[PDB]
Amino acid sequence: SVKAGSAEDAAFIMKNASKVIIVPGYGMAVAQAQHALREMADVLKKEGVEVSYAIHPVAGRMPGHMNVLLAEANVPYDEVFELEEINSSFQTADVAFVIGANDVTNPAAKTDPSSPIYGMPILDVEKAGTVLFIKRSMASGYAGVENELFFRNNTMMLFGDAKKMTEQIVQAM
Amino acid sequence: MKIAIPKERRPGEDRVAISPEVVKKLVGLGFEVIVEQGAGVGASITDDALTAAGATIASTAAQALSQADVVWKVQRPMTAEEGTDEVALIKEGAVLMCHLGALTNRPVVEALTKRKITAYAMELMPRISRAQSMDILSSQSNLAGYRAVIDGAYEFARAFPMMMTAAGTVPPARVLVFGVGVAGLQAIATAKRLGAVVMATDVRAATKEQVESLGGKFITVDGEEFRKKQAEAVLKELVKTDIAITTALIPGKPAPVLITEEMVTKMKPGSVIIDLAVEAGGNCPLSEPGKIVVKHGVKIVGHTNVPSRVAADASPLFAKNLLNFLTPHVDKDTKTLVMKLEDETVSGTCVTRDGAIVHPALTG
Amino acid sequence: MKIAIPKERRPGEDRVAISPEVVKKLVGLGFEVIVEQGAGVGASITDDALTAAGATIASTAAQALSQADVVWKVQRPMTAEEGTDEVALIKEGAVLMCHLGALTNRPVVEALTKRKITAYAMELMPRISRAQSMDILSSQSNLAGYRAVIDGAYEFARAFPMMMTAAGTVPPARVLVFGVGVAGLQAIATAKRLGAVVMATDVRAATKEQVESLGGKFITVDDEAMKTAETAGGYAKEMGEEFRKKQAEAVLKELVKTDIAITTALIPGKPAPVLITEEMVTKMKPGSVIIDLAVEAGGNCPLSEPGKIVVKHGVKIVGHTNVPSRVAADASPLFAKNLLNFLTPHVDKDTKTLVMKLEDETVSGTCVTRDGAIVHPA
Ligand SMILES: NC(=O)C1C=CCN([C@@H]2O[C@H](COP(=O)(O)OP(=O)(O)OC[C@H]3O[C@@H](n4cnc5c(N)ncnc54)[C@H](OP(=O)(O)O)[C@@H]3O)[C@@H](O)[C@H]2O)C1
Numbered sequence: 036s037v038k039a040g041s042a043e044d045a046a047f048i049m050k051n052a053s054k055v056i057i058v059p060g061y062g063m064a065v066a067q068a069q070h071a072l073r074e075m076a077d078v079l080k081k082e083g084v085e086v087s088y089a090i091h092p093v094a095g096r097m098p099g100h101m102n103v104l105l106a107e108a109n110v111p112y113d114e115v116f117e118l119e120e121i122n123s124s125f126q127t128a129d130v131a132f133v134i135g136a137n138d139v140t141n142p143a144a145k146t147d148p149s150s151p152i153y154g155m156p157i158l159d160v161e162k163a164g165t166v167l168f169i170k171r172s173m174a175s176g177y178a179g180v181e182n183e184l185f186f187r188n189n190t191m192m193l194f195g196d197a198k199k200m201t202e203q204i205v206q207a208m
Numbered sequence: 209m210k211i212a213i214p215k216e217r218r219p220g221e222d223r224v225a226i227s228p229e230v231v232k233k234l235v236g237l238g239f240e241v242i243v244e245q246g247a248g249v250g251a252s253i254t255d256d257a258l259t260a261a262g263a264t265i266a267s268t269a270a271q272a273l274s275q276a277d278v279v280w281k282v283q284r285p286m287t288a289e290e291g292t293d294e295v296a297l298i299k300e301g302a303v304l305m306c307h308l309g310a311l312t313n314r315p316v317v318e319a320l321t322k323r324k325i326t327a328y329a330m331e332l333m334p335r336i337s338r339a340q341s342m343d344i345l346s347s348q349s350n351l352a353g354y355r356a357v358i359d360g361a362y363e364f365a366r367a368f369p370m371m372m373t374a375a376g377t378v379p380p381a382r383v384l385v386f387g388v389g390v391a392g393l394q395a396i397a398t399a400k401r402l403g404a405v406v407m408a409t410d411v412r413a414a415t416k417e418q419v420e421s422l423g424g425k426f427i428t429v430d431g432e433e434f435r436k437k438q439a440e441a442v443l444k445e446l447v448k449t450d451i452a453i454t455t456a457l458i459p460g461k462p463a464p465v466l467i468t469e470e471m472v473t474k475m476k477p478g479s480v481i482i483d484l485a486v487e488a489g490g491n492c493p494l495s496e497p498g499k500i501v502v503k504h505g506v507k508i509v510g511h512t513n514v515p516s517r518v519a520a521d522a523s524p525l526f527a528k529n530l531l532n533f534l535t536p537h538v539d540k541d542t543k544t545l546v547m548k549l550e551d552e553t554v555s556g557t558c559v560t561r562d563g564a565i566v567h568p569a570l571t572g
Numbered sequence: 573m574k575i576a577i578p579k580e581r582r583p584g585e586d587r588v589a590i591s592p593e594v595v596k597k598l599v600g601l602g603f604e605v606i607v608e609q610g611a612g613v614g615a616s617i618t619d620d621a622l623t624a625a626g627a628t629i630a631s632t633a634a635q636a637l638s639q640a641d642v643v644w645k646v647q648r649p650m651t652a653e654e655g656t657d658e659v660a661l662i663k664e665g666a667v668l669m670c671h672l673g674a675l676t677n678r679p680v681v682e683a684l685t686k687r688k689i690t691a692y693a694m695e696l697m698p699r700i701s702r703a704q705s706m707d708i709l710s711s712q713s714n715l716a717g718y719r720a721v722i723d724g725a726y727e728f729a730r731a732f733p734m735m736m737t738a739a740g741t742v743p744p745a746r747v748l749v750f751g752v753g754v755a756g757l758q759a760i761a762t763a764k765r766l767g768a769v770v771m772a773t774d775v776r777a778a779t780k781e782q783v784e785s786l787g788g789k790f791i792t793v794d795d796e797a798m799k800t801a802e803t804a805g806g807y808a809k810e811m812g813e814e815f816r817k818k819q820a821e822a823v824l825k826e827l828v829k830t831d832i833a834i835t836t837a838l839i840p841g842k843p844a845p846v847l848i849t850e851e852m853v854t855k856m857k858p859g860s861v862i863i864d865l866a867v868e869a870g871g872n873c874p875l876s877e878p879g880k881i882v883v884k885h886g887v888k889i890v891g892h893t894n895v896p897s898r899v900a901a902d903a904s905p906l907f908a909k910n911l912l913n914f915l916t917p918h919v920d921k922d923t924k925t926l927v928m929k930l931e932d933e934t935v936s937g938t939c940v941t942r943d944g945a946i947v948h949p950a
């Protein structure tokens with residue numbers, strides 16, 4: 036029941052498009068997709084699109100997981116923001132490029148009291164015009180729960196490896 | 209209310225359970241925030257910084273704690289059996305929140321119970337998504353992993369990164385991380401970003417992918433049977449290793465021996481071992497608490513209280529864990545603290561309350 | 573023909589002027605290599621690795637140097653005045669290559685002169701691009717720059733990198749590096765490797781591009797006067813009191829928010845320039861660290877004291893001596909290869925002798941004394 040898109044279809048959605056928030060997570064680290072991610076960010080930025088990175092406190096599997104890999108890939112600190120700093124901006128962003136994150140975006144954290152993820156603060160990616168998930172399959176994250184964002188109109192599911200997809204997304208630009 | 213934060217009096221403890229950021233938040237909750245003078249000096253937090261944030265500076269620990277309804281500190285209070293009766297300074301009926309070490313230290317729990325103090329042991333925080341922000345084990349272990357690499361690099365007589373120069377090339381350092389939990393993962397990240405070749409090993413299966421997600425390589429190509437079997441593919445890499453970092457704990461029990469004396473004989477001279485598990489017996493038998501010992505040409509480093517070697521970053525994070533745990537229970541109106549008993553974070557962490565030991569593991 | 577390398581007897585000197593690779597090349601050139609027993613222990617080079625490479629082991633320092641036609645040291649040999657006479661151990665008429673420190677140390681020179689010993693002071697290498705391979709200042713100061721950041725990180729009670737965590741954000745350390753030569757450039761790279769935001773400043777104009785290529789942000793001060801800053805040889809000159817105030821004013825904005833200050837600034841034949849006064853360190857944050865690499869040449873910070881960490885005004889001012897010896901196991905193979913690349917062009921094919929080309933500007937600038945006659949224009 037999911038709108039399953041491809042590298043080509045996902046690419047031009049972000050081309051124009053005025054504002055893009057990159058939301059990286061554990062799958063970005065697993066794939067080592069961070070050099071290819073900053074490449075894409077530079078392709079967006081040079082055309083004139085606003086690019087920023089939204090980092091959840093527990094993105095990845097360790098404190099500062101996304102920070103070290105983005106620092107390796109030379110993304111500058113002035114474009115990287117913490118949850119409480121960046122959560123308002125999703126309303127103004129056209130796309131929420133979710134690369135290997137899932138639990139970090141899941142609105143059951145504030146909706147469903149029965150879930151294990153309930154009461155953890157999350158990034159409000161749903162408030163963006165479109166939500167691009169990159170993720171290999173329909174499997175769960177760390178918490179083991181479904182994301183209701185996967186199968187709602189404004190979302191697009193990109194079934195692939197995060198480095199491979201992002202490299203393939205960079206082709207069409 | 210009347211929340212107080214004293215200086216840490218235990219030897220080598222430079223952390224404090226407050227920051228200026230958290231002081232501002234506490235007065236916003238409706239607290240008079242009191243803190244002992246000199247408490248944040250080891251954490252590079254001056255008395256003026258706390259005063260500017262809204263805190264009152266008390267001259268002694270007794271004055272700081274006399275009227276306090278809530279007490280925050282990092283390590284457990286000392287008892288009269290240790291020479292300094294710190295629990296006596298705490299007001300009767302008050303709330304204590306700290307790293308108590310409650311399941312290994314029953315005497316402090318007994319002593320707090322005598323004065324009807326309600327004690328919340330922060331190390332027993334339940335492992336749920338909601339309480340990750342309240343988790344002192346993670347916040348303090350993380351910095352200890354970073355430190356391990358800084359200590360290793362300081363003791364090592366070669367540089368971490370590869371350097372191709374006019375006068376020749378010097379190779380990168382080779383790092384082996386035993387145990388890839390919170391500390392081990394940050395040690396992998398810090399070693400790798402400094403230019404070292406980083407290997408790692410762990411008993412748990414999901415760790416292999418975590419090691420690889422930081423650009424490390426996991427050691428495996430192809431009761432007490434962990435120890436005997438593991439060290440064969442590990443020994444191959446350990447012989448090439450410059451800095452070995454051991455971070456493995458078994459909760460409650462002593463630490464597993466991951467490098468024997470036999471194994472350190474087969475290491476090259478000028479190598480260093482950082483044993484972060486030294487307070488629980490060490491992953492290396494040669495390690496000694498608070499000492500750097502040299503044997504077989506190898507430095508075995510066994511610093512105590514590694515988070516306190518990063519006290520100035522450790523203390524703000526600890527104070528935030530305390531604030532994130534505290535904040536949901538302040539009734540905003542009528543200046544009160546009502547710790548909800550349905551709450552898993554309250555029930556899992558509470559050790560004694562109103563003059564009676566509460567925790568299942570500690571009850572008679 | 574025979575070559576010898578003793579162990580470094582001076583307090584704290586863990587380096588050595590040899591490696592297994594360099595032994596093999598000397599055997600290829602036609603030298604019998606007699607290293608002293610346990611000379612590479614501080615550099616983590618075993619006697620076995622020297623033996624397998626083709627050296628012989630000698631028990632004492634005197635036995636290693638007894639018949640040696642050429643001797644390689646790191647630091648200058650200790651005289652009878654200093655404590656124990658190494659200069660007498662060396663065979664008369666032999667040739668000596670080391671960081672002799674010729675200009676400051678005149679007693680060691682005349683002692684070598686009186687025994688007909690031909691001394692080659694490696695710090696007096698002419699600054700020419702082909703001689704980068706044989707330049708001891710660059711190889712050692714590069715490792716000192718790396719080590720300054722490790723020293724800084726070790727003395728600092730906070731972490732270097734930015735980390736978003738559940739307990740809150742730990743911000744990145746801010747590093748400021750004063751003087752961007754060989755040591756300062758490596759201090760930028762190593763600080764940036766650890767996730768710090770790195771500022772830097774210098775008097776030379778060409779180093780602004782170098783700072784920005786490493787991801788640092790440069791502090792401009794007097795762009796007009798920075799074009800008349802570098803010499804023909806590539807080293808800095810004394811800028812004066814007016815520029816000092818101009819610089820001190822410009823750097824103040826960033827120094828009050830700086831966590832680690834690494835100072836590397838040197839001027840040949842002069843005391844090191846004062847870049848952080850006592851008024852400036854009182855302005856700094858408590859818990860901050862100053863690494864004074866120029867401490868043995870006066871110091872860029874007056875509060876720094878040789879061989880000690882000084883705590884004042886809430887700030888640690890660190891001033892270790894012999895910073896390359898804190899990286900002795902990397903420093904030593906590179907120091908040995910600096911000497912090999914200096915020596916190699918003068919060994920004959922199948923004569924089995926050494927003829928140091930007197931015509932060569934590399935050779936003339938290095939030589940101090942030869943056959944009992946001080947040739948250097950000092
Ligand atoms: N940071 C810390 O200190 C922590 C300490 C341990 C616990 N911890 C938890 O971890 C998750 C991390 O959230 P995130 O959204 O980053 O990741 P997840 O929501 O877990 O899942 C990310 C997805 O990335 C995908 N993933 C996994 N590998 C890939 C690759 N290679 N390429 C693309 N995507 C990948 C995978 O789905 P898939 O297997 O593709 O169907 C996952 O569902 C969160 O629940 C934290 O509480 C964090």
Ligand SMILES: NC(=O)c1ccc[n+]([C@@H]2O[C@H](COP(=O)([O-])OP(=O)(O)OC[C@H]3O[C@@H](n4cnc5c(N)ncnc54)[C@H](O)[C@@H]3O)[C@@H](O)[C@H]2O)c1
Pocket residue numbers: 698699700701703704707709710713750751752753754755773774775776779805806807808809811836837838839840845847
């Ligand atoms: N073989 C060669 O051609 C050779 C050898 C060595 C150095 N060099 C060149 O010389 C240059 C300097 O290298 P170095 O490491 O020997 O320099 P150095 O050790 O003499 O001094 C370090 C730096 O301090 C700076 N400095 C001096 N006074 C200052 C002040 N008042 N304020 C701020 N900065 C001040 C200098 O400009 C220099 O960059 C480099 O460009 C290097 O490439 C060339």
